[PDB]
Structure formats: structure tokens, C-alpha cells
């Protein structure tokens, strides 16, 4: 166990899970919270919405404001740049793991 | 493709490479710099010694001053905790990459 790594790793894991999920389908932030927990990653809003906003700014997520069932909500989906990023990032993890035996 | 990730990733990669090398054998700072370069991670002393010092503080590296061949030098080697950390960390990277395929 190594806490500096695990603390940084947490940020990577969240980030890549968002892109992965937002690639598969359109996602609400509320659901992302629960989905991430289900995968073993503790994220409370205050990290999530920020990183979501950052992800859009970086042009890897695109968002829609949308009124559905009398409810105003924002949905996110992965841009093609986001899809690229996910694969590049996944590969980088693979190369590192193999590099160190 | 994703420079925010790659910026953080670089720090992780360096950290793990040190542990990997310092696990296999005792290492001088100068040699770490060359080995890291060879692996495509440009690290200058202003970065390295801090990382090394932090790694020691986290109890994953141990350093020794010793006089060898009339030349006084400091060596670093991975503690058993460092060896553990490397494995746990490597595995964590593997599980992430696989679970976002
Ligand atoms: Mn899922
Ligand atoms: Mn080497």
C-alpha cells in the first residue's frame, strides 16, 4: 500500500471511468456518482461536477441542457476527442504496468 | 491527446520507475537519471532528489551514505514496503486499464 500513488490513481480512475461511461451513453452527474461507487471509487460532488466541467472545457465531454419529464438537467457524452483520449490514456497505463515488470 | 492526464501520468511513471529500479538493486541518483531518460522520461536533479526524498519519507526508499573506492556517495534501494507498493501499484494500473477497455 502506497497513499501518494493511490491518491493520484483515484483521480485518474474517476477521469477515465467518466470518459468510458460517457462514451457508451449520455450520462447525468447524479448517476455517475452511483456508477463510480459501484466500481469501487468514492467520489462526492465537489470533485465530480468540477472534473465534468473541466472535461468539457478540455473538449473531451460535450454537455446538453435538457428538459425531460418536467426536469431541467445536464447530460454529458464523450466527444471524438474524448474517445481518443480514453484509448491513449488506457494504452499509457498498459505500457507503464508492463514497463515495471 | 489528453495533456492534463499526461502531465500527472508523468509524475506517477517516474515514481514507479524509481521503485522498480531501486527494487532490483542499489542506485545512485546519476544512474537513475540515465535509466529514466532511456525509458523516455526526462528528469532533471531539481525534480529527482525531491521525489527520492519524498519516497524515503513515505518509507518506500532508504538511502545510505558510503565511501567506496575513495569516493563518498549516497545510494538508494527500495524497502520491502517499496517492493510491496510497486506490485500493488502495478496491479492497480492493470485493473484500471482492463476495466475501461
Ligand atoms: Mn459501469
Ligand atoms: Mn532499465
Q: Quick summary of this structure?
A:
Chains A, B: Homodimer. With 101 residues, chain A is of the alpha+beta class.
Which SSEs are present, and which pair or pack?
The structure is a homodimer of 101-residue chains.
Chain A: H1 3-24, H2 29-39, H3 48-57, E1 61-68, E2 71-78, H4 80-99
Antiparallel strand pairs in A: 1-2
Helix pairs in contact in A: 1-4
PDB class: dna binding protein
Keywords: Transcriptional regulator, DNA binding protein
Assembly: dimeric
Model description:
The structure is a homodimer of 101-residue chains. With 101 residues, the first copy, chain A, is of the alpha+beta class. Chain A has one domain. Chain A contains four helices and two strands. Chain A has a two-stranded antiparallel ribbon. Chains A and B meet through helix 1 and helix 4 of A and helix 1 and helix 4 of B. It is classed as dna binding protein.
Amino acid at each position: 500500500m502506497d497513499p501518494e500513488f493511490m491518491r493520484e490513481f483515484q483521480r485518474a480512475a474517476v477521469r477515465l471511468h467518466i470518459l468510458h461511461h460517457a462514451a457508451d451513453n449520455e450520462v447525468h452527474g447524479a448517476w455517475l456518482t452511483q456508477e463510480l461507487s459501484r466500481h469501487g471509487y468514492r467520489v462526492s460532488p465537489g470533485t465530480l461536477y468540477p472534473t465534468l466541467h473541466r472535461l468539457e472545457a478540455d473538449g473531451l465531454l460535450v454537455s446538453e441542457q435538457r428538459v425531460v419529464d418536467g426536469r431541467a438537467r445536464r447530460v454529458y457524452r464523450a466527444t471524438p476527442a474524448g474517445r481518443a483520449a480514453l484509448t491513449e490514456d488506457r494504452r499509457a497505463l498498459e505500457e507503464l504496468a508492463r514497463e515495471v515488470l
